[PDB]
Design a protein around this nucleic acid. Structure first.
Lengths: 379, 379
RNA sequence: AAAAAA
RNA sequence: AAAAAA
RNA sequence: AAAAAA
């Protein structure tokens, strides 16, 4: 077989090619340490390589109330150990300053050159607000965070310190979330696994994690929801994508999904967690499938019209959207003649469909207009 | 299978990813402690993380009269332990002040800086009045509480202290109910499990819990009562939702229900208890199904017309409501011709249906008018 | 999350 | 060796 | 990477 070469570098056996040792500090005054960590973050301290330990202590305190034995027996740890993480407990008790935990001289002087209004749960749940759209850029991410804060306030669920709502603070949090794997992983793991018993902060994390599913992986939804159509007999390929020119992108896409599947329950977060195989799902690798799948999906989702694509894709996208709207009006019209609708009943449904389509069309246009206005504002 | 990725993060094995240790204080003067707790709540004291212990003592006193052995063998405890709760008994007897139970310096000073008219049963039953509409916002919740108090007074069932009817007090209670899982859980558990022997306070809790079923989960009633129609042969899909455009939302909805089902008897309270999987039932995930299911349901329930939806949904909702009213008039008219109604009997039923529909139409309009007036008042 | 429920 | 790929 | 989601 001569085509196997094309997939040779896509699928490898799991093993460990890296080692990452994280100090786990075991102190009696865990709450005091957590308060110092929050203050250091409010002050804009970059803990660099030591950040994993400080973020871990906030997580350990929040999730296990200092129970280090359970923390290190958790599913999160067992998962991480299989990827080269090593957790070592260091009993550096009696600590009054974070500079006494640090093994990086720049961190030590930043901390040397130093009461807050928050606990670890609030710090972590605030950080989790950045998971949806984390991978869409800092502008989009910050707007999403602001929108969620306003909702949580309206819910009466949680109120964050006003200092944290400043841009300068949110950018510190954004950078920690973009560069620190462990904090993203732990927030996702807890949000996706707690069953009952959530505190206000856990409700926030759980909701934020749910909103991050497939964030940055729209191609996995537009292709699987509209191009590859699963039915009782198998998977049908949508007519606008049955062209030989794009069928190869469809099969290449299936190969990419086959590699993402190795991550199980974390696969929906592959773009946030930079999981292996996510690079096989880039839009540039599937230029016809990307424009077509989004274009047909846009004919159904009136809000999907707000999604931007590059210039290469915009014209094909519109061609696919218009073709899908026409294909569906035909399909809706013929489906009624296979139903036991007599005449009078059928006519009611016809008027419903016409109204439904007009309402959607108007909604779609409104979103297109906003997309253009947003680009004009960025320009 | 390539569509399995879409559900990968929705269903996980139950296990414990958190530990929450709750001190259970064992004192001889349990009634005196309960009175101190009520006074602290009347004073607006925020017990933060210790709130679980104080709320637990009020519950333990009310439900078991101080029998700690039975309390800790209860179904409520066995359930909670499976989610990481740990209950430890601390024999801190001889206590005169709550500051002597507390392990949080802000709580200690608030209590340091300090006779009431109520018992634990009243405190707990008052708090339970906030369960219906707890998740609809503080305005709606407070109005519901006021309406229930007036009813209970008319019933001659229970009279609450006038101080508790102030807004400032009700907001303390609202915040405890919004953020403390354990109190919501315990009120629901008792309300849903007592069979006979209810005191005035238990009658109030039981009624308040019954009214909280599916509070915040209207989508689970409008879809299951009107879109997915169970009959002897299986489940039929309502004509206004047989469009391919929404059939995917219907199947996605079934997947969400499949995850809520893991909670058994507590599933109807998933929005109040923030139970895992409830985030798969959000209206934004099912925009056509949400507007249509509510719209058709509104054609049957004249009071359902008072429910607000966002602007995205309002036009589709009305289109579905009008289509359903027309579909039903046709259905009612034809059904009579399949019944042994001769002529004279059939005509009586026809006039009945016409009157019934006119009465409902007028009632629906009245509710629509109120919905608009309420929005105008909020504006 | 948004309506009714002695 | 020659192009595209958040 | 780009939209919506109490």
């Amino acid at each position: 077989d001569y085509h196997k070469i094309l997939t040779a570098g896509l699928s490898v056996q799991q093993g460990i090619v890296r080692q990452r040792v994280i100090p786990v500090y075991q102190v009696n005054n865990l709450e005091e340490i957590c308060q110092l960590i929050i203050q250091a973050f409010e002050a804009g301290v970059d803990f660099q390589e030591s950040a994993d330990s400080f973020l871990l202590m906030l997580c350990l305190h929040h999730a296990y109330q200092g129970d280090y034995k359970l923390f290190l027996e958790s599913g999160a740890v067992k998962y991480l150990e299989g990827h080269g993480f090593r957790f070592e407990v260091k009993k550096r008790d009696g600590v009054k300053r974070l500079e006494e935990l640090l093994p990086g001289k720049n961190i030590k002087r930043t901390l040397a050159a130093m009461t807050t209004e928050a606990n670890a749960g609030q710090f972590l749940s605030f950080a989790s607000l950045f998971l949806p759209k984390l991978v869409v850029g800092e502008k989009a991410c910050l707007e999403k965070v602001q929108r969620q804060i306003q909702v949580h306030a309206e819910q009466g669920l949680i109120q964050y310190p006003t200092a944290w709502q400043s841009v300068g603070h949110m950018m510190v949090i954004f950078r920690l979330m973009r560069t620190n794997f462990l904090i993203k992983f732990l927030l996702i793991h807890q949000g996706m696994h707690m069953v009952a018993g959530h505190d206000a902060n856990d409700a926030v994390i759980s909701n934020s994690v749910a909103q991050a599913r497939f964030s940055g992986l729209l191609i996995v939804k537009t292709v699987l929801d509209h191009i590859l159509q699963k039915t009782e007999r198998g998977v049908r390929l949508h007519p606008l994508a049955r062209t030989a020119k794009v069928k190869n992108e469809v099969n290449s896409f299936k190969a990419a999904l086959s590699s993402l599947a190795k991550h199980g329950e974390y696969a929906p977060f592959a773009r946030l967690l930079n999981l292996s195989g996510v690079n096989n799902l880039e839009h540039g690798l599937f230029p016809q499938l990307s424009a077509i799948a989004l274009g047909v999906a846009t004919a159904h989702g009136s809000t999907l019209a707000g999604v931007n694509v590059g210039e290469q894709y915009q014209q094909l996208r519109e061609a696919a959207t218009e073709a899908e709207k026409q294909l569906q009006q035909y399909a809706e019209s013929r489906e009624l003649d296979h139903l036991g609708l007599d005449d009078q009943e059928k006519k009611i449904l016809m008027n419903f469909h016409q109204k439904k389509n007009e309402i959607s069309f108007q909604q779609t246009n409104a979103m297109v207009t906003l997309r253009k206005e947003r680009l004009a504002k960025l320009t």
